[PDB]
Design a protein around this ligand. Structure first.
Ligand SMILES: Nc1nc2c(ncn2[C@@H]2O[C@H](COP(=O)(O)OP(=O)(O)O)[C@@H](O)[C@H]2O)c(=O)[nH]1
Ligand code: ALF
Ligand SMILES: [Ca+2]
Ligand SMILES: [Mg+2]
Lengths: 315, 754
């Protein structure tokens, strides 16, 4: 037999990254041909991150440090991002000059006020490794790409004793109308909450908080009459970005009920788990919680092995 | 896809000696890429439309002179490289040749290559409404009299749906109102033709659009209302909000500087009525996006997962008994985007041993095989570089004569003929068929190895000569579906007749789709249809048959589908099957009545608002709206009431046509056809349900062989959105905005505590 597992969660939360780890751990991994098929999307995420950082300079009114670097800004500002196939010489020379500017690094420090990806520093620090003509994307470079999901895709995975049908859905506000056609015969709901969302606002609505919607989507999901015998497995993604974000920006400003001390990535990790577990009206049904990191293949292999025995014991 | 740019040697105009089976003309193309006009023999121009050119041949592939009177005067070999033949027609059966012979050197090949890029362009065929009104204006500016003036009878025959209103329309603009006078083309600039299509066709349907979207203040549309026009009405509500983002106030100001003409209203960021009536026909407000037309489909799947375009008895021009076969029907089919042609080869004459192509004992004329194999070799990959499958039918019962048709395939096709299998995919059980990208330019033959069918049930066993060419697609005698699955050879195929595949359709449709996930299946119409009537191919596309073969002669409702759904994917003749008909882990019933688990349904709602310029006489016009998909989607066929007698600006006050449960929307296809009173055809347009937008759009109707018409167009208002089941449509409103719902949820629990 097989089981149908849902991967639900809000936008930019790391659902397809959890699928890519299943393709690496419990499936057919990325070979030398499949890694080379991803090299055009790594170039497109370098330009999408930079063009959103260039247009973040005038709306925040931050002047550039060097005037020589400013002449490179209008060159990258007019790159059509979808028609990028190669990474040529004036394109690398402009962005590598644009990354070392102290006025850009002040705009990157204030990246909570616009929409920027979470792998925008992994790419524009290994830019010497990504620009070379013999560029093959390594397996950590493939897990950091950003291709936004639309629709319902069903991935089956063989574990030599049972087959898991992991269903990958979207996360945006226009994509939650399509979640209805995968709610039939659901074994488990793997809810994926990014822990580093507690200061950014939504891309679909630039006023509401990101953590307060994932908190509100978890309240809606487990209070359906439909999911009355389904074991909801709460994943807390992005455990690495919490350790960088908590050291300068706090949790108390965006949540007034945080009594814990500042700069404490372990005590704040419990409080967000205290925030999500407490939204359960029935105490007889319990929620299996797991902190995780979706690009650490050991930290998916350790967690999913604890999930695979949790599903098989209850079923 | 590039816009149709004209190379400057096609605008200055070279000199050809136009001849018909000796007058010197100068061919020119207008600077938009619309017409091909030449100063005729009577000092009057004759414009051949560029968008109705099938092919432009040159070199030794052009038509040679056969009259000794015309051969000597032309100068008859260096004279074989100057001949240019432009073949054009409304249907592939009746084509009008246009022969030219140049006088300068090396100019016939820059012409006939660039003349084929304009006549096979995708952004000119799917161009906007304002592009097609400009095409009718260029038709007036080119066709002049001896004096170089536009006669008023030339404007009168165009809008022949009225006469008295037209003559007073030109009189209001200060032009010549009398019928037998002539306007000079200096005083007929395109600004005046805008005022002439406004003072003649008064449209009250746009004024119900302006009053709807918030212009209670009558003169102008405010900029803040116009962003709320495009982001709500015109935007497809199934798309994502990160991939295709909504507009910005800086972004939706480039439209006002592009469309709004009044500068006293342009500086205040306001769009007038004349600026809004231009925007709906703009290039941005099209019924189909740019990505739906280009070669954008995944071409790496096996060949067993693609709807291949096909043709049955391609060599015929008419019915199966009375007609005359022609070699020209192979060229006119393969340029259309057909990929599977048929060849019924017979044993030749005793003194002149040469095989021919005919029909079996039906008194049809016989064309030689060596002329037909030159036809498929010439124009296989002129419009799409994808593999052509020559469906032979060997009746040659001579082992000697088979070496002639074996050497003809190796000598004429040559490098492109796939003799040996590809190195990645051997001829082993269990390995799938290759991909269409893996054989870009490879011609595959189809022959044997070593009552309702007529000729196709009796064919001789092939010998060692013709069996070496059959490698991947090999026809086998059909036994069952259990023996087709326990054998597990994914390269063999079996061709069904129409009446045998229909009893195999209802006996077991769940096993028919799983046979097409591995192997191919050809379907051809039976021998009872002796008048070349084509069955509906959507009966066999719901079970995933690939080579559904249709008679390309007669363009009934069936051929209007088969030429409509393959215009997409870049006119390549290969549509990808939906994702549940080619995955071996999933399986679904094509005769379902509920929404499939995993397949996103849709809920289409089409409503016909009005029409423009539809016909040339005072008749009534109605509009049919069908949907060709799964048999659960096809149940509703709607039709408007006829108009009062207007063929000029007929308005339909109709309720919307509700297509509520589109179960498989990545297969179904809308069909908006407009007829006349009495049932005379005017135009039709087939749109897929996946990529049809929303809001008040334009539809430019096409004729029967899917060529675009210049003047006639409809105006529809669609609402293509995702289907929510009626049992829980309120638990899908809490997902879309869960912030507002979680504040309302505890509020209903707190107020109950009191
Ligand atoms: N640093 C870090 N980045 C992550 C982690 N998990 C996900 N991401 C990033 O989150 C981004 C968006 O995730 P994505 O798979 O696109 O989620 P989806 O849009 O719902 O499909 C990806 O670019 C990942 O690189 C993590 O544990 N650590
Ligand atoms: F949830 Al997403 F791209 F934002 F899959
Ligand atoms: Ca035949
Ligand atoms: Mg995803």
């Amino acid at each position: 037999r097989e089981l149908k597992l849902l991967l639900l969660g809000t936008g930019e939360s790391g659902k397809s990254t959890f699928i890519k780890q299943m393709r690496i751990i419990h499936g057919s991994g990325y070979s030398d041909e499949d890694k080379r098929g991803f090299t055009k999307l790594v170039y497109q995420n370098i330009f999408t991150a930079m063009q959103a950082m260039i247009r973040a300079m005038d709306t925040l009114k931050i002047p550039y440090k060097y005037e020589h670097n400013k002449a490179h800004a209008q060159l990258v500002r007019e790159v059509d991002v979808e028609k990028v196939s190669a990474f040529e010489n004036p394109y690398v020379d402009a962005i590598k000059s644009l990354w070392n500017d102290p006025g850009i690094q002040e705009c990157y420090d204030r990246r909570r006020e616009y929409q920027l990806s979470d792998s925008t520093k992994y790419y524009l620090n290994d830019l010497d490794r990504v620009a070379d003509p013999a560029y093959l994307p390594t397996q950590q470079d493939v897990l950091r790409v950003r291709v936004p999901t639309t629709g319902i895709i069903e991935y089956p995975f063989d574990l030599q004793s049972v087959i898991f049908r992991m269903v990958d859905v979207g996360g945006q506000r226009s994509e939650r109308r399509k979640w209805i056609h995968c709610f039939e015969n659901v074994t488990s709901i793997m809810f994926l909450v990014a822990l580093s969302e507690y200061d950014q606002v939504l891309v679909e609505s630039d006023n509401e908080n990101r953590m307060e919607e994932s908190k509100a989507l978890f309240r809606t999901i487990i209070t359906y009459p439909w999911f009355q015998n389904s074991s909801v497995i709460l994943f807390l993604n992005k455990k690495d970005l919490l350790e960088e974000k908590i050291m300068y920006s706090h949790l108390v400003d965006y949540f007034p009920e945080y009594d814990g001390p500042q700069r404490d990535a372990q005590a704040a990790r419990e409080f967000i788990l205290k925030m999500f577990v407490d939204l359960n009206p029935d105490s007889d049904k319990i929620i299996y919680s797991h902190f995780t990191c979706a690009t650490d293949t050991e930290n998916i292999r350790f967690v999913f092995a604890a999930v695979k025995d949790t599903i098989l014991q209850l079923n | 896809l590039e816009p149709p740019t004209v190379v400057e040697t096609l605008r200055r105009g070279s000199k050809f000696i136009k001849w018909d089976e000796r007058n010197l003309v100068t061919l020119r193309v207008d600077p938009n890429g619309f017409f091909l006009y030449w100063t005729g023999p009577n000092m009057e121009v004759d414009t051949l439309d560029i968008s109705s050119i099938r092919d432009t041949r040159t070199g030794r592939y052009a038509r040679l002179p056969k009259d000794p009177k015309i051969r000597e005067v032309l100068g008859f070999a260096r004279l074989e490289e100057k001949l240019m033949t432009v073949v054009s027609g409304p249907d592939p059966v009746n084509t009008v040749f246009l022969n030219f012979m140049a006088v300068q050197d090396d100019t016939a090949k820059v012409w006939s290559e660039e003349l084929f890029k304009l006549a096979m362009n995708i952004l000119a065929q799917n161009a906007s409404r304002n592009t097609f009104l400009r095409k009718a204006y260029t038709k007036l500016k080119l066709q002049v009299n001896q004096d170089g003036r536009i006669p008023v009878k030339n404007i009168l025959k165009m809008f022949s749906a009225d006469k008295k209103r037209v003559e007073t329309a030109l009189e209001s603009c200060g032009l010549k109102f009398n019928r037998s006078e002539s306007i000079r083309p200096d005083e007929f600039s395109l600004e005046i033709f805008e005022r002439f299509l406004n003072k003649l066709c008064l449209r009250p349907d746009i004024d119900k659009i302006l009053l709807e979207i918030g212009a209670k203040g009558k003169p102008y549309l405010t900029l803040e209302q116009l962003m709320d026009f495009i982001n709500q009405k015109q935007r497809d509500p199934r798309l994502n909000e990160v991939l295709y983002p909504p507009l910005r106030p800086s972004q939706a100001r480039l439209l006002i500087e592009k469309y709004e003409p009044n500068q006293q209203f342009l500086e205040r960021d306001q769009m007038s009525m004349e600026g809004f009536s231009r925007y709906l026909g703009g290039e941005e407000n099209g019924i189909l996006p740019l990505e739906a037309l280009d070669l954008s489909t995944d071409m790496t799947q096996p060949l067993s997962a693609y709807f291949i375009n096909s043709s049955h008895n391609t060599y015929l021009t008419a019915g199966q008994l009375a007609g005359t076969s022609s070699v020209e029907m192979y060229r006119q089919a393969l340029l259309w985007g057909c990929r599977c042609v048929e060849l019924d080869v017979w044993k030749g004459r005793p003194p002149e041993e040469e095989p021919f192509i005919t029909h079996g004992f039906t008194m049809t004329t016989e064309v030689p095989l060596r002329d037909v194999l030159e036809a498929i070799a010439e124009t296989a990959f002129k419009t799409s570089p994808y593999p052509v499958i020559l469906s032979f039918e060997n009746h040659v019962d001579s082992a000697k004569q088979q070496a002639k048709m074996a050497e003809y395939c190796r000598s004429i096709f040559g490098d492109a003929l796939l003799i040996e299998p590809l190195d990645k995919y051997p001829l082993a059980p269990g390995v799938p068929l290759p991909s269409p990208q893996d054989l870009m330019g490879r011609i595959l033959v189809k022959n044997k190895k070593r009552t309702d069918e007529g000729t196709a049930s009796s064919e001789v066993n092939a010998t060692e000569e013709m069996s070496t060419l059959v490698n991947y697609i090999e026809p086998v005698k059909f036994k069952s579906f259990e023996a087709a699955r326990k054998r597990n050879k994914c390269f063999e195929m079996s061709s069904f007749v129409e009446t045998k595949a229909m009893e195999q359709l209802t006996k077991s449709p769940m096993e028919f789709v799983e046979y097409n996930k591995q192997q191919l299946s050809r379907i051809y119409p039976k021998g009872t249809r002796v008048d070349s009537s084509n069955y509906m191919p959507q009966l066999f596309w719901n079970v995933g048959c690939q080579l559904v073969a249709l008679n390309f002669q007669t363009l009934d409702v069936a051929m209007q589908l088969n030429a409509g759904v393959f215009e997409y994917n870049g006119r390549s003749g290969y549509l990808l099957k939906p994702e549940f008909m080619r995955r071996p882990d999933k399986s679904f019933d094509p005769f379902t009545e509920v929404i499939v688990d995993g397949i996103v349904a849709n809920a289409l709602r089409v409503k016909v608002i009005s029409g423009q310029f539809l016909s040339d006489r005072k008749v009534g016009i109605y509009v049919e709206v069908d949907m060709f998909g799964l048999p659960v989607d096809t149940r509703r066929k709607y039709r408007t009431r006829t108009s009062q007698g207007n063929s000029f600006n007929p308005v339909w006050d109709e309720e919307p046509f509700d297509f509520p449960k589109v179960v498989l929307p990545t297969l179904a296809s809308l069909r908006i056809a407009a007829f006349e009173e009495g049932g005379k055809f005017v135009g039709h347009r087939i749109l897929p349900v996946s990529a049809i937008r929303s809001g008040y759009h334009y539809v430019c109707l096409r004729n029967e062989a899917n060529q675009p018409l210049c003047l006639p167009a409809l105006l529809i208002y669609t609402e293509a959105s995702d289907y929510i089941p009626d049992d829980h449509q309120d638990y899908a409103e809490a997902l879309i905005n869960p912030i507002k719902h979680v504040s309302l949820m505890d509020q209903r629990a707190r107020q109950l505590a009191a």
